[model samples]
Target chain A: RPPDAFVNRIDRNIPVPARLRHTPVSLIEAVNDFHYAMMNDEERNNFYYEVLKKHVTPETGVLEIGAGSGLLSLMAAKLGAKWVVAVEGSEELAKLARENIRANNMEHQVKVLHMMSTELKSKHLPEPPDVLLSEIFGTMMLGESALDYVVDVRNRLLKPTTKIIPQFGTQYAVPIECDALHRISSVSGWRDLDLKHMMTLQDTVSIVFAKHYGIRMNSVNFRRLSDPIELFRVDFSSSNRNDIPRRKHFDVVAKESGTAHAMLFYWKVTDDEFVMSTDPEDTVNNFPRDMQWGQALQLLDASNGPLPTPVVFTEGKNYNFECNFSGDRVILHMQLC
Target chain B: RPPDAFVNRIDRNIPVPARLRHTPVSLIEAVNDFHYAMMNDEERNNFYYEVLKKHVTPETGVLEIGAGSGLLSLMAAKLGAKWVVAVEGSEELAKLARENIRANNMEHQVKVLHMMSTELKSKHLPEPPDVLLSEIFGTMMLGESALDYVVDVRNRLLKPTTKIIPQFGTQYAVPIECDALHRISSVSGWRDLDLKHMMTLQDTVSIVFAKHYGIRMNSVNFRRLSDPIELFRVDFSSSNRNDIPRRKHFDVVAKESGTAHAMLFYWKVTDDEFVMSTDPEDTVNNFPRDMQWGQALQLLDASNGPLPTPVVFTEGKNYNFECNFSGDRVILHMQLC
Candidate 1:
């Protein structure tokens, strides 16, 4: 397990980052603090200290990539970067990130390289660094080798404008609800099998819908999202998949009505601003965890016993979370109650 | 929100109750515990008490449908079934199904009814029932409308073999490492600024595939199941959507690498032996609890980070969590990491 602790075999259907997962906080943890009124967290670290602090000047030169837990290389070492390198592959989160850059002792001002920013180049960076901080977002942002690890370290070590904290982004969606997901989908169990007739002459009958896709993970609790529709962008100069963007009719309202199933939803972008969610919030600031990327469950439509309370939205009356995506595939539909 | 809590919209697709839909409790509390484990736990009430404790005898007589919270009509009122009834459509869980038949004091041996089992008949039932006991199961089990609510209460009141606790079922898959579901699909704040990063920067990343159809809720974690593969059954004498079952494959076993998404399986069926569980360790008597569900992410390969340790199980060589389910729907395919 060496080449930076080997694990990269991906392509199971595309959307890789070695495999970033997360979703069990009793089902996305919510009861209040509803996605904290979409960012203003004091203008997010003062917009990351005004774009990596006054752009590394002196003919700019830097190139970082997915240096998570490195605090964007301490905001590109408080931006005055003349050789910031960074990179990062995760040696147990890079050994607590070399003890957090020697606990903020900057360890001679930010170096960090554990591996895989496309295995660095520019003569193995002992020098090249004009400007290029990193944070590698996901949750429905762009994960095809994460913007090709910042366009392969900006075509081999910095120099063009040197700025790229988020040269682009734009995801969105809407539709919501929550009631501790109905005592987590009630059925209270006949108060403990009451009279255990111990099997009671067969045929107890259960053929209704067969757990309709049995999901129930700690009961969801989201609301008031449904108004986003952008879909793509992160230019790295200017590449194209037709430049992304394509959302439509996302409604999903039923604050109660039992079985609908599906809808992973998420987003969070930043060149300067971007936040959007579908449910289960927060991850160093939400939008499906600041855009590491996730969104494709989209399903709804079905109801009955103990579930139809306030639930009233529109677009086919309620429940319309569609998705087509196509390329690396994504086509969820919904309706099983 | 009142008229007996209304909920039948017609052209069908009403299911919204992800436990009230605030949305995103990681896909509505696992589909509201998979709609209370498809209406009251253990796949189909332990296959309806394993064929009514061994296929009724004392002149049986059960007949049930949508009996929401009555626990197999008090297990066919202690198995003698001498004329049971149940029914139920919600109206306050059918007024708690008369306090669950007087807390299983069987209120003079079962007879609940509130309506809608596709609007029953046989003169609001008072006879028939050698055994129908009905539980309803739906989430992808192929009987979504419980075969139009048990063939409209089996052509107005069942009696042909009468017994049918779960005459059939099957749905399975394997491929994990979920990585806490890509940390709930990474990134957040809706990918860079306005319009949600042009809707997920034109994709490419995979492995998070969960395509379990139905009937298997649980028996014990089966440690990431990868053997079962039936996906269809239910011959309530004839059962159809063409008996609905096609969409099968069985090669699962990724066990580790992270991101296979959904399919936390369960189901071994047996009733007269009295066994039930959505498996939160068989929540005892209250039988309707215990079903966690959810797992099906099936992304397989959409990587863009340095990710590789979320929750593996190690089984089939190199991330093989595959499927096609033969379209009209059910179309999951992996490997884009």
Candidate 2:
């Protein structure tokens, strides 16, 4: 059972009806999701453990944003943090986290708060934290509104010199050949009905790519024809607010001559000592091969047939890459340079 | 958006931490689980759809228990039910159910209640509902504490003659030969570790069997040695509290001579109009093999080798089977009589 502080605190301001109070799906999913995350996210767990083990000391005061299950905060406490504040946004997970803290006898060192980091106040913390720890990145890095939250936190909560775990993250992309993904994502003739007008292949590809990028995957699904090209990098330790909506260009070189049917997207997170990469080659060689996020494949064509053929990536030619992050959407364009 | 009624009604007695309030794991799992249930449980969904279509009328007042996404309640309304009360225990799912109801434009006819059916009173309902809709059975039929909840609901909330969607359910099992499952559940020797004493194969088999029986299975794993025999049957319409803990005997004959490594368990559910079975043979031959519950295999011996060769059901001899359900667990005994 969780501690009293972890129990759900219902706000009278937003009165919930008796009808909606009884839905159990959220609770079941919370338990199941956490179970999977705790068990299968080995890379993530390992990285965070290494970060906390190396960074946290008895004199450290830690503050974690979006502390689901409060594992990181607990890790910080176990690693010798003087005090830890775990801020979570969900009532159920906050309760579970509090229970976990108590289970580990870390109640004296860790305080769990069930509220969004943006809604938190300095008074809510025991004192100004010297280390801000968080693992809120989504499949596409900023898909879960990481930028907005991180920017808000830096502006209001943390000290300018606060050490941030996972100091920075970078996104990368490569051209790939995958018919399996194309057939499903692109518009095609289904028996006699030509559903070509349903959605443009570009739109379908982006949507499908982002969706699949959210899960763990094996490299056998697609073959990369080009070396990965860096898209954008975000420095979490920096206090700069103009971090996103920045555009950068890259000179991409093809490793092999193949039709560029799709683009494979992956990312890497690092605090220097440990790095977690979702690159296809790395994922293939890795034992578990699965992670919370996987590489995404987006098609560059509108038709599913092999007749028109996709744009080919030359073996020695340079490909101009323009990557833009508008703080909302990440758009990339590749063409012969 | 779901109606305010479906919003979480926080309990003042147990103050929840602000962190626990925002945990969305359960909500996420509820959506994912329901999506899988709706897509993969084709046969089961079709059966429920048929029942709803055939039984619900404009004059009927329906009450659905455990309305995760309020699909059943929505089904009732779409099937022409005059009024529906969807009782869900999770606040998040109740909100989702309300959204689904509104999405289908059935909000006028359906009211979402976020509470346990056991706590519901007559005043909370417009009138005594004529039909009760639910899909509360776990893989083992009663594994989800369904019997207790259903009995409570029937005794406290429903009319004496209310119709149940699944009129009854039955459990079945057969002795089988499965080496693949045994190696994982039982002990094995790799490098002189003497792992044989790890878990008694008999104890491991029962525990593993019960656990696996709780999930859906792909039919290519085990081979059945005998025809399935009926273990127990549940009649939801009987209104009899003495329906469980009943014992019955069955005569089984082996189809092929082999070491009885384990027992294959499956079940059938019916309301007269449609029947759903998880039998291996049925699952193999069926077009859509997905079922809410899958088959499970339990080992019979502790030894890895084929020593003390299991009593072979002779080509022509009959084996006596005694199955007992103690409300909480199912116990089986097979013997040569």
Candidate with the greatest lDDT versus the true structure: 2
lDDT of 1 by residue, A1-337 (tens): 3332112332233232322222112111110011211122334445555666657653445566766345556556555465555666754445444555665566676676777777777787765665666645433445334566666667777665556775654444433343333333344454355522211111111111122323222222444434444444456555444344232334454544433322334445565444333233443333222222224334333333333322245333455544334333121123222
In angstroms, how far off is A44's CA in candidate 2?
1.8
Tell me the deviation in Å of residue A299 in model 2: 2.8
Q: Write the per-residue lDDT of candidate 2 for residues A1-337, one digit (tens) a residue.
A: 3333111332222222232233243543343323333324456667888877877889899999988867678778878899999999988778767876776778999999999998999999877888888888765666577766777888888876688887888877777766434433333322222333222112212323332322223523566777777766788776343654455667777778877766677888888768977776665544222333555654454233422235677788776654444435443433322
TM-score winner: 2
Q: Comparing to the true complex, what docking class would candidate 2 get?
A: incorrect
lDDT (Cα) of model 2: 0.60
Whole-model Cα lDDT per candidate?
0.44, 0.60
Ten-residue region with minimum lDDT total, candidate 1 chain A: A198-207
Candidate 2, residue A290: Cα displacement in angstroms equals: 2.7
Best by DockQ: 1
Models 1 onward score TM values of 0.32, 0.50
RMSD of each: 18.7, 14.1
